[PDB]
Amino acid sequence: VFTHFGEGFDYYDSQLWEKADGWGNGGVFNCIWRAYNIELKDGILNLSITDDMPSSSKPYAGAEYRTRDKFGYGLYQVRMKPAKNPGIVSSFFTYTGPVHGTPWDEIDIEFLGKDTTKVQFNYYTNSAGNHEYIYDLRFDASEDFHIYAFNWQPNYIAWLVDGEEVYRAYDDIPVHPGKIMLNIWPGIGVDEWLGAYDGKTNLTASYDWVAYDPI
């Protein structure tokens, strides 16, 4: 049963959100997620990359903040300001995966820190990705908060920036409802895509609010 969802990041409510803590995604993600790199202050969600704890398997600690609940077709909106640095990604995306008994379906707004005048849109449907599209913003997303969105329908996904649609994709669209997830992370083995990360300290992607409306 999907219903309006609104989140202002005023307070952490463990029934609604989950601070990812003590696992990483592996592969190209060169960090473990730490609940301590999530901060809610003055109504802004701050997700940071820092140096990880001494006994971590990775050099860096990221943050990922994720809804308890899952969401279906409709309009997903974020008001956010990604981080700028080579070799990192600041994200708003939906995700479900084999662990939850479904195919890996996911829809992505990724800000490649190497160049925050661009956004990357992408989606995975039954694990099949390779739908990358880089949209030129003609502003620097790292300097101010802006509103990014996708409207996910059975037959397409539309992405939008500051209220206007800028890209639509038709091919093999995701099916299974997913959690909303926000993250920031440094990459490894992907110098071509992200640039090399340079260990620059205390990068923060900030998020003013998120909304979902079943339409």
Catalytic residue chosen out of the listed positions 7, 64, 106, 192: 106
Q: Of the candidates 18, 21, 208, 213, which one interacts with Ca ion according to CB under 5 A? A: 208
Task: Please confirm, yes or no, whether 110 is among the known catalytic residues.
Answer: yes
As to burial, measured by CB atoms within 10 angstroms (0-12 exposed, 13-18 middle, 19+ buried), residue 127 is exposed
User: Strand pairing of 203-213 and 44-51?
Assistant: antiparallel
Whole-number minimum distance, CB 43 to Ca ion, in Å? 3
Nearer to Ca ion, 43 or 199 (CB): 43
Which tokens in the block code for residue 185?
Answer: 């992370």
Residue position matching structure tokens 């992408």: 122
Nearer to Ca ion, 144 or 192 (CB): 144
Whole-number minimum distance, CB 42 to Ca ion, in Å? 8
Return left, alpha or beta for 100; rule: phi > 0 is left, psi -120 to 50 is alpha, else beta.
Answer: alpha
- x/- mask, Ca ion, residues 70-89, rule CB under 5 A, reads --------------------
Q: Of the candidates 5, 8, 18, 200, which one interacts with Ca ion according to CB under 5 A? A: 8
Concatenating the DSSP letter of every residue in 138-155 gives SS-TTTS-EEEEEEEETT
Q: How far is CA 6 from CA 19, 74, 76, 144, 186, in A?
A: 18, 13, 10, 21, 28
Task: Please confirm, yes or no, whether 106 is among the known catalytic residues.
Answer: yes
Stretch that binds Ca ion, among 7-15, 32-40, 107-115, 121-129 (CB under 5 A): 7-15
Q: Is 209 in the site for Ca ion (CB under 5 A)?
A: yes
| CA pair distance 189, 186, nearest whole angstrom | 10
Beta bridge partners of 101: none
Whole-number minimum distance, CB 72 to Ca ion, in Å? 24
- Residue 8 labeled ligand binder: yes
Whole-number minimum distance, CB 81 to Ca ion, in Å? 12
Nearer to Ca ion, 122 or 183 (CB): 183
CA 92 from centre of chain: 3
3-state secondary structure string across 184-201: EEEECCCHHHHCCCCCCC
Q: Is 17 in the site for Ca ion (CB under 5 A)?
A: no
Q: Is 43 in the site for Ca ion (CB under 5 A)?
A: yes
Catalytic residues: 106, 110
- Residues engaged in binding Ca ion (CB under 5 A): 8-9, 43, 208-209
Binding residues: 8, 43, 208
